[PDB]
Amino acid sequence: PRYLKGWLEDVVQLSLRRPSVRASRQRPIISLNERILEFNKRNITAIIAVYERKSPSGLDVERDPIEYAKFMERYAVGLSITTEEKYFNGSYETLRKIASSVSIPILMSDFIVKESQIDDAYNLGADTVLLIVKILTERELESLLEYARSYGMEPLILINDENDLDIALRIGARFIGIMSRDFETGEINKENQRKLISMIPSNVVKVAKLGISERNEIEELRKLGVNAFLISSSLMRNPEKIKELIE
Numbered sequence: 009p010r011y012l013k014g015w016l017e018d019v020v021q022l023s024l025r026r027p028s029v030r031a032s033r034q035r036p037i038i039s040l041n042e043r044i045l046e047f048n049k050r051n052i053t054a055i056i057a058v059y060e061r062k063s064p065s066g067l068d069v070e071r072d073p074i075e076y077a078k079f080m081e082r083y084a085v086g087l088s089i090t091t092e093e094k095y096f097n098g099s100y101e102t103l104r105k106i107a108s109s110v111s112i113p114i115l116m117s118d119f120i121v122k123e124s125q126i127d128d129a130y131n132l133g134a135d136t137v138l139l140i141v142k143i144l145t146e147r148e149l150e151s152l153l154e155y156a157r158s159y160g161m162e163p164l165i166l167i168n169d170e171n172d173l174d175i176a177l178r179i180g181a182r183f184i185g186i187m188s189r190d191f192e193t194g195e196i197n198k199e200n201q202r203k204l205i206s207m208i209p210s211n212v213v214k215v216a217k218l219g220i221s222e223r224n225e226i227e228e229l230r231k232l233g234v235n236a237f238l239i240s241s242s243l244m245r246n247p248e249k250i251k252e253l254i255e
C-alpha cells in the first residue's frame with residue numbers, strides 16, 4: 009500500500025492481517041454496473057443503498073440488517089455492505105447473511121489491500137468490491153483490478169482528487185466512484201466532486217458517493233453525467249427516504 013497516517017494507517021494494518029475465509033458461494037455474480045445502465049436506460053434513478061452501523065463521520069445507527077436489505081431490494085439498484093470492523097462496525101457475517109437473503113447486486117465496501125480479501129468477497133456472496141486509489145500504489149491497483157476481473161467482477165474504483173483520476177483512467181477502470189469528502193479531514197467538498205465528475209469520459213460508469221442527499225442535488229449530478237448514487241447516512245437514518253429520492 010501507500011504511505012498513510014492516522015486512522016487510515018490503522019485500518020490498513022488491520023486489513024493486512026485480516027484472515028481469509030473458506031466458504032462456498034451460493035449464487036452467481038449479478039453485475040452491479042450492468043444493472044445501473046439498465047436503470048439509466050429506463051430513466052429510473054439508480055441508488056446503491058449503504059448498510060453501515062458506524063462511520064468515522066459520526067454515523068451511529070443500530071438497525072436490523074435483513075429488514076433494511078429486504079426493504080431496499082424493492083427500490084435500490086444495489087446494496088453496499090461495509091465489512092470493515094473497527095471503524096464501521098461491519099463484519100463478514102453481515103455480508104454473508106444479506107447476500108443469502110436478497111437477489112440484487114452487492115458491493116463489498118472495505119479497505120482492500122490484498123488478494124485474499126477479494127477471495128473473501130466472492131466466497132461470501134458479494135458481486136463486486138470497492139478499490140480505493142488513495143491507499144494503493146498504481147501497481148497494486150492494477151493487479152487487484154485484474155484479479156477481481158478474473159472472478160468476473162468489475163470493481164468500483166473510488167477516487168478523491170485529480171491524481172486518483174489519472175491513475176484510474178491509466179489502468180482502464182470502467183466503474184468509478186467519486187467521493188464528496190476527503191479521508192484525512194473528513195471535510196465535505198462538493199465542488200471538487202462536481203469538478204471530477206465532469207472530467208470523466210462518458211463511457212465510464214460514474215457513481216457519486218454521498219452521505220446526506222436531497223432530490224435537487226441528485227438531479228444536478230445526473231445532469232452532469234452521474235449514473236448512480238452511493239448513499240449512506242440519509243438512508244441508514246431514514247430508509248423510506250429512498251422513495252422521495254427516486255420519484
Ligand SMILES: [Cl-]
Pocket residue numbers: 186187188189190217218
Ligand atoms: Cl465521500
